[PDB]
A paper describes a structure:
The influenza virus RNA-dependent RNA polymerase (RdRp) is a trimeric complex with multiple active sites and functionalities. The acidic polymerase (PA) protein component of the RdRp plays a critical role in viral gene transcription by mediating the process by which the polymerase performs “cap snatching” from host messenger mRNAs. The RdRp endonuclease activity that is necessary for this to occur is located within the ≈200-residue N-terminal domain of PA (PAN). RO-7 is a next-generation PA endonuclease inhibitor of influenza A and B viruses, but its drug resistance potential is unknown.
In addition, we previously reported that the resistance-associated PAN substitution E119D emerges in response to the first-generation endonuclease inhibitor L-742,001 (8), and we therefore also determined the complex structure with this mutation at 2 Å. Both complexes show no significant differences from the WT complex. In the case of the E119D substitution, the holoenzyme only has one bound metal ion at the two-metal active site, but the second metal ion is restored to the active site by the coordinating groups provided by RO-7, as seen in the E119D–L-742,001 complex. Sequence encoding a loop-deleted version (residues 51 to 72 replaced with a GGS linker) of the PAN WT or the point mutation (I38T or E119D) from CA/04 was synthesized and inserted in pET-28a(+) expression plasmid (Genescript, Piscataway, NJ), expressed in BL21(DE3) cells, and purified by affinity chromatography and gel filtration (Protein Production Facility, SJCRH).
Numbering used by the authors: -2 to 53, 73 to 195
């Protein structure tokens, strides 16, 4: 029973906690043990949901937070109706306005380090990348940040509040030094 586990459960809403638990268990991982992983998945999930709420109604299809099979099923339907190339790895959203998949990343390092890593691995030229840090920095493919500044600002604010909350509980150092 870790302090980080209890922090996560009282920092994120239950819908996000529940989805993060399912995601970890789907790959045989325990939120009770891999607690920094637990906190990172919850954080990333909330960012994805705030991101999808930033556009017009029906702008984004949400891929994240789904079962592996249903996630690829929705990706298949999108590709087979828009003609967009199927990505090698699961993205997080699809943008019906810009007609591209989005892989969101949240990093405790400098944004550009994590971007380079995700690009190289993704190997999907068309999949748009959007990285947020816990320091208010962001980095997006082709300097195209998709959303307007106000919707990105509230994401960056939330991420910094999570950071302060961990720090006030002496959990931030372990969280940063575990990525
Ligand atoms: C399962 C899906 N994953 C993997 N993995 C994911 C995850 C989920 C369950 C168990 C382990 C891990 C690796 S740790 C981590 C840390 C923070 C947020 C998400 C995650 N990702 C890391 C960064 C992402 O941007 C992202 O989209 C994912 C993601 O979606 C996949 F694409 F592989 F099918
Ligand atoms: Mn994802
Ligand atoms: Mn992601």
């Amino acid at each position: 029973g870790s302090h980080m586990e209890d922090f996560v459960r009282q920092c994120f809403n239950p819908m996000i906690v529940e989805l993060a638990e399912k995601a970890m268990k789907e790959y045989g991982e325990d939120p009770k043990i891999e607690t920094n992983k637990f906190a990172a998945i919850c954080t990333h999930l909330e960012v994805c949901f705030m991101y999808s709420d930033g556009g017009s109604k029906h702008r984004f299809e949400i891929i994240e937070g789904r079962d592996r099979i249903m996630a690829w099923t929705v990706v298949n339907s999108i590709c087979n109706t828009t003609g967009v190339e199927k990505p090698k790895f699961l993205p997080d959203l699809y943008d019906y306005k810009e007609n591209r998949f989005i892989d969101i990343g949240v990093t405790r390092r400098e944004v550009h380090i994590y971007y380079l890593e995700k690009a190289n691995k993704i190997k999907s030229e068309k999949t748009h990348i959007h990285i947020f840090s816990f320091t208010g920095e962001e980095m997006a493919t082709k300097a195209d940040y998709t959303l307007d500044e106000e919707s990105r600002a509230r994401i960056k604010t939330r991420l910094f509040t999570i950071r302060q909350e961990m720090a006030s509980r002496s959990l931030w150092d372990s969280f940063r030094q575990s990525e």
